[PDB]
Amino acid sequence: TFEPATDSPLPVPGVQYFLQHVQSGKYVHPHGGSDMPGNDTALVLHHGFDEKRDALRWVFVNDAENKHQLKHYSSGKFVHPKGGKVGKEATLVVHSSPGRPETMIEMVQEDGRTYLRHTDSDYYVHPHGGSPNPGDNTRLVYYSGYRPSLAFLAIPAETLFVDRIEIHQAQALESINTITSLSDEHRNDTDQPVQTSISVALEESLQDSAQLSFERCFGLKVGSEFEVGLPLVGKTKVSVQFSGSWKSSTIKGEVRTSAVKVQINEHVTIPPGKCVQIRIDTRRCTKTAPATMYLRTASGIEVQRETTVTSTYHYDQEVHVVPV
Ligand SMILES: OC[C@H]1O[C@H](O[C@@H]2[C@H](O)[C@@H](O)[C@H](O[C@H]3[C@H](O)[C@@H](O)[C@@H](O)O[C@@H]3CO)O[C@@H]2CO)[C@H](O)[C@@H](O)[C@H]1O
Ligand SMILES: OC[C@H]1O[C@H](O[C@@H]2[C@H](O)[C@@H](O)[C@H](O[C@H]3[C@H](O)[C@@H](O)[C@@H](O)O[C@@H]3CO)O[C@@H]2CO)[C@H](O)[C@@H](O)[C@H]1O
């Protein structure tokens, strides 16, 4: 189950988020709720939420023009300290002016929780008055220091595409095993060699699996199913379809193809008066690999998320006729 106390993800720049004060469950709004808030309009906490409400969307910006800043999505205004310098009890406001070093703001992780902090300072974002459960329209201010009641959750507010997942080949660990299976015995009780068909079913013992796992939670919305190629054995690509939620720290995959058979039917020449069986050796690669996810916004912005790919894949298989 999802717990923000351990699982709140760090937001990726360029992506739309809602911002929620964890302990009150309130969202960060421009005071008054406008899609076009006025310059020096205060950021406040308010219970009000609808997924369709663009006035509640925020985007972290980190580039040459705006290094460590925070943008109101619907207006394009930046989050500034009222008056233009961070200090004690400076109200967070929107303003249609570029960010500066003295306005920098980002989400940070401190002791296992996520906070808003003015970069290169000990000033963090507090509800004015410092209530752990502030009421609607409580303004957000900079103030020195943090504590758990101040934590925020950046909830993803748009749906991204998964373009590819590239494993870090130097950190990939592979453990190989052989799964060995035997058919029913077949006897040729005649005095002449005989063509016979020996069949065996192995669905249960050759089951493939795969998953992505995350330190906090995945933290991004990509829809109910996505498919990518992953190197489940050496560099060999196998398509895996994943179904999960932004809140999951483990996203289960379904391995979509197999290089091996789970129903075997072998044409055997059985010598006179001999008994034989088929032996099936199937190789299994259990793999763990740190990887980088390559994602993309509808607007064409390319973002990255680190993960770990864990998998079990049956990849080569051999069939031998053996005496009983
Ligand atoms: O407050 C954040 C803002 O501080 C500095 O801007 C100056 C004032 O502090 C700010 O109050 C003032 O706001 C103007 C806005 O420019 C006008 O369109 C109009 O909407 O009235 C308000 C007054 O409420 O603007 C001045 C500078 O023009 C920083 O320069 C700015 O970047 C932010 O950090
Ligand atoms: O507002 C965030 C702040 O709330 C609590 O602090 C109290 C007041 O809310 C805060 O305004 C007040 O600030 C003092 C400041 O300590 C003094 O140095 C001087 O500037 O006066 C202001 C009042 O304008 O401080 C009190 C607590 O003394 C929380 O305790 C604090 O941690 C923040 O979350």
Automatic annotation (TrEMBL):
<feature type="binding site">
    <location>
        <position position="126"/>
    </location>
    <ligand>
        <name>N-acetyl-alpha-D-galactosamine 3</name>
    </ligand>
</feature>
<feature type="binding site">
    <location>
        <position position="80"/>
    </location>
    <ligand>
        <name>N-acetyl-alpha-D-galactosamine 2</name>
    </ligand>
</feature>
<feature type="binding site">
    <location>
        <position position="89"/>
    </location>
    <ligand>
        <name>N-acetyl-D-galactosamine</name>
    </ligand>
</feature>
<feature type="binding site">
    <location>
        <position position="129"/>
    </location>
    <ligand>
        <name>N-acetyl-D-galactosamine</name>
    </ligand>
</feature>
<feature type="binding site">
    <location>
        <position position="32"/>
    </location>
    <ligand>
        <name>N-acetyl-alpha-D-galactosamine 1</name>
    </ligand>
</feature>
<feature type="binding site">
    <location>
        <position position="129"/>
    </location>
    <ligand>
        <name>N-acetyl-alpha-D-galactosamine 3</name>
    </ligand>
</feature>
<feature type="binding site">
    <location>
        <position position="53"/>
    </location>
    <ligand>
        <name>N-acetyl-alpha-D-galactosamine 1</name>
    </ligand>
</feature>
<dbReference type="InterPro" id="IPR035992">
    <property type="entry name" value="Ricin_B-like_lectins"/>
</dbReference>
<feature type="binding site">
    <location>
        <position position="97"/>
    </location>
    <ligand>
        <name>N-acetyl-D-galactosamine</name>
    </ligand>
</feature>
<feature type="binding site">
    <location>
        <position position="80"/>
    </location>
    <ligand>
        <name>N-acetyl-D-galactosamine</name>
    </ligand>
</feature>
<feature type="binding site">
    <location>
        <position position="100"/>
    </location>
    <ligand>
        <name>N-acetyl-alpha-D-galactosamine 2</name>
    </ligand>
</feature>
<feature type="binding site">
    <location>
        <position position="81"/>
    </location>
    <ligand>
        <name>N-acetyl-D-galactosamine</name>
    </ligand>
</feature>
<feature type="binding site">
    <location>
        <position position="29"/>
    </location>
    <ligand>
        <name>N-acetyl-alpha-D-galactosamine 1</name>
    </ligand>
</feature>
<feature type="binding site">
    <location>
        <position position="83"/>
    </location>
    <ligand>
        <name>N-acetyl-D-galactosamine</name>
    </ligand>
</feature>
<protein>
    <submittedName>
        <fullName>Uncharacterized protein</fullName>
    </submittedName>
</protein>
<feature type="binding site">
    <location>
        <position position="147"/>
    </location>
    <ligand>
        <name>N-acetyl-D-galactosamine</name>
    </ligand>
</feature>
<feature type="binding site">
    <location>
        <position position="147"/>
    </location>
    <ligand>
        <name>N-acetyl-alpha-D-galactosamine 3</name>
    </ligand>
</feature>
<feature type="binding site">
    <location>
        <position position="83"/>
    </location>
    <ligand>
        <name>N-acetyl-alpha-D-galactosamine 2</name>
    </ligand>
</feature>
<feature type="binding site">
    <location>
        <position position="97"/>
    </location>
    <ligand>
        <name>N-acetyl-alpha-D-galactosamine 2</name>
    </ligand>
</feature>
<feature type="binding site">
    <location>
        <position position="100"/>
    </location>
    <ligand>
        <name>N-acetyl-D-galactosamine</name>
    </ligand>
</feature>
